[PDB]
Structures are given as structure tokens and as C-alpha cells.
Design a protein around this ligand. Structure first.
Ligand SMILES: [Mn+2]
Ligand SMILES: [Mn+2]
Length: 390
């Protein structure tokens, strides 16, 4: 079909202006050790790190003690039979409340998410998967975008282990879109590395410990689509359905070889990762902070040198900045507005009228088609400025 942009239905409108450092969406702060008061303040310009808000749960992540049953080798619990249950679809505040009540009665849960970034500037969390020893949950993070914050009661309860595989970006996505934080994380990716398994991916773990073969024929899928297709519903359920059992085996092996403390340390730091706008990103790019990383051509004159002439970097740069502004304005990804190959195509052929712009041998996007005149003017200016100057 066409898929209507889910953003249009968000309770709170999106803001890509980036006129202030990221502000935590957190209004309440359960399992608090340090009041939310001190949390929402600021950290005035340093030199390495410009002004910004700190991670609202950083303190707890450092002080909150782990569940004593995590340091103990325990009899593992096999994953429940896939066919013995259906994944529980959650898309109403009432369904959300019941799941929540259920999660509060666990010792650990497995969590994962599905994300979308083609038709959104920063990106949007489209689905959340949660598994208990007994059931698999599929949460519509689109329809419940503003309600999900209540999961912090469990996501920040240090008495409940939250298991994720390589959650470095998921931690970022969770705060940015849902204002969710995690205290009591166990990252199976770091567990796999510490133990020294040949491969460290989720698929590798699923294949060898749960005899489940994965199909990456969905990491390019569109998670905004409602209802979810059977195959996508299954592939999402598979992210958390087998994870707690894998958690048991890796944990026991870590205790058995005295490496658990290191994995918990690595995990606390994954959970401490803070999301910030590229504009207010710290100088030295560290793993402690994340800011939007262009998924396309090198800022300005690209290295994909489509034989990019000398005096055309000004043109290149204007196209880049124009693209970014339109992307931000319409809340779209830069590639949806204009992919590097098209941008490159414009710079290479330098069309100066609408006909030239829309008939580019390569092809054209809706945005380029709708701004053909502006682009033809922009390009014409670039050429005129060249013929002059020198
Ligand atoms: Mn994930
Ligand atoms: Mn997935």
C-alpha cells in the first residue's frame, strides 16, 4: 500500500529543529535513589562536552545492587514451546496495564525492539518485544508511544534482570522515543564475547542454543505496517522467546569462569549510554554518548568520488544542507528526500531547468520533483559563481 506516516497521529508533535539539547521525556522516576529533581537540570558547557542534560538513571545504574540470584549458578529454564502459546499483542492502555502487572511478577525478562528510519528524520521505534519465562509479548510502540513510560517501574527495578542482545542502540532508542530507561541490564552480546564464542550475533546464538534459523529478510522490512504480517510477527517474537534460556547458559558459564562481574560492568555502561542531538554532541566521539550518525556520503564532497570535480564542493555542500533541512522539515530521512546517488547525479550533470532536473537519466524522488525549480536555481547559481570568481 502506501502506509500513512504514524507520526501524524502522535499525541505530541515531532521536533527536528534541534534548538536545545535532548530533554528526557521522563516525568516520573520509580525505583529512585536520587530524586528526579536533581536529574532534570543541565551540565553547562565544558570544552569537550557542551551543555546537556545527564542520564536520569545514571546514579541508580551505578549504586543499585544486582539481584543476588544473578551471581548464583541456577538450573536453567528451557524456553517454552513455541506452539504452546500465541504472542500477546499489546496496543491499548488496558492491555498495557495487564502486561505490566505480569512483568512485575518476574525475576527476569527478555527485551528487544524494531525500528524505522526511512520515513522519519531521527527514526521511530515501531515495536517492542518482551518475554517472560511463560509468554511472549508484542507491543505496538506507535499507538502506545506516550503510555509506555510506565514500564520504567519494571525496566528500572534492579530486582528484575532485563536481557537484551547488543542493546547499545536500543538503550538510545528507548529514551529518545519512549522515555524508558534500564537498570539491571544483562547484555548477551557482551556475555558471548567474554566467554569467547566464535561468533557473537543473535542469529548465531539462536542457531546454536535454540536450533532456530533466522532470516535477515526482514532487517529491511517496514515495521510501521499494521497489522503485522505472520512472518514478521514470528520473526519479532523470535528475538525474545529464546533469550532467557540463553541468558541462563551464558550466566552460569560466566560465574563458572569468574567473568560475570566484567559482563555486568559492560552492561551497566551500555545502559548508561546517553542520547544527544548531533548539534550538542561531545567533541571526542565516545561510546558513552550517541548522536545521529549520517548513514550516507561523507559530509560535503563525498569519498564516493563520482569523479567529483574541484570547484563543485560548494554545490555539493548546498545540496547536502538543503537536503538535511527538508528532511528535518518534513521529518523524513535524507535518503528518502534525495539519495546520495541522485545528489551526486545532480552535481555531475548540473541541470539548470525543471526539465533537466526531473528527467535525470538516473531517476528522481518526490522531493526533488516538487522542488525542481529551487534545485535548478540553486545549481544555476553555483555555475554562475564558478564562471565568475576565477
Ligand atoms: Mn535489538
Ligand atoms: Mn528483530
Amino acid at each position: 500500500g502506501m502506509v500513512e506516516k504514524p507520526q501524524l497521529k502522535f499525541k505530541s508533535p515531532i521536533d527536528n529543529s534541534e534548538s536545545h539539547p535532548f530533554i528526557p521525556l521522563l516525568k516520573e522516576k520509580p525505583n529512585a535513589l536520587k530524586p528526579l529533581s536533581e536529574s532534570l537540570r543541565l551540565v553547562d558547557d565544558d570544552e569537550n562536552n557542551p551543555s546537556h542534560y545527564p542520564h536520569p538513571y545514571e546514579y541508580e545504574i551505578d549504586h543499585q545492587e544486582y539481584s543476588p540470584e544473578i551471581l548464583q549458578i541456577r538450573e536453567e529454564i528451557p524456553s517454552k514451546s513455541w506452539d504452546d502459546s500465541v504472542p500477546i499483542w499489546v496496543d491499548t492502555s488496558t492491555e498495557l496495564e495487564s502486561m505490566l502487572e505480569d512483568l512485575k511478577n518476574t525475576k527476569e525478562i527478555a527485551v528487544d525492539l524494531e525500528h524505522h528510519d526511512y520515513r522519519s528524520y531521527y527514526g521511530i521505534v515501531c515495536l517492542m518485544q518482551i518475554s517472560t519465562r511463560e509468554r511472549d509479548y508484542l507491543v505496538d510502540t506507535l499507538k502506545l508511544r506516550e503510555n509506555l513510560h510506565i514500564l520504567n517501574e519494571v525496566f528500572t527495578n534492579p530486582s528484575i534482570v532485563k536481557v537484551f542482545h547488543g542493546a547499545f542502540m536500543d538503550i538510545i532508542w528507548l529514551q529518545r522515543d519512549l522515555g524508558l530507561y534500564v537498570v539491571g541490564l544483562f547484555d548477551t552480546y557482551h556475555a558471548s564475547k567474554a566467554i569467547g564464542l566464535p561468533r557473537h550475533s543473535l542469529a548465531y546464538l539462536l542457531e546454536n542454543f535454540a536450533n532456530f534459523k533466522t532470516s535477515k529478510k526482514y532487517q529491511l522490512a517496514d515495521w510501521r505496517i499494521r497489522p503485522l504480517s505472520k512472518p514478521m510477527t514470528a520473526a519479532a517474537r523470535a528475538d525474545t522467546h529464546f533469550l532467557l534460556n540463553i541468558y541462563d547458559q551464558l550466566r552460569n558459564k560466566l560465574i563458572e569462569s569468574n567473568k560475570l562481574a566484567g559482563v555486568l560492568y559492560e552492561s551497566r555502561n551500555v545502559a548508561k549510554r546517553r542520547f544527544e542531538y548531533s548539534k550538542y554532541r561531545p567533541l571526542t566521539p565516545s561510546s558513552e554518548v550517541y548522536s545521529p550518525i549520517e548513514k550516507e556520503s561523507p559530509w560535503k564532497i563525498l569519498m564516493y568520488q563520482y569523479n567529483i570535480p574541484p570547484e563543485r564542493e560548494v554545490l555539493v555542500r548546498e545540496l547536502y544542507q538543503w537536503r538535511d533541512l527538508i528532511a528535518r522539515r518534513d521529518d523524513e530521512s535524507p535518503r528518502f528526500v534525495m539519495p546520495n546517488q541522485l545528489l551526486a547525479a545532480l552535481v555531475a550533470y548540473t541541470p539548470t531547468d525543471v526539465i533537466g532536473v526531473v528527467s535525470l537519466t538516473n531517476g528522481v524522488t518526490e522531493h526533488v520533483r516538487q522542488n525542481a525549480k529551487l534545485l535548478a536555481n540553486l545549481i544555476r547559481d553555483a555555475l554562475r559563481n564558478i564562471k565568475n570568481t576565477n
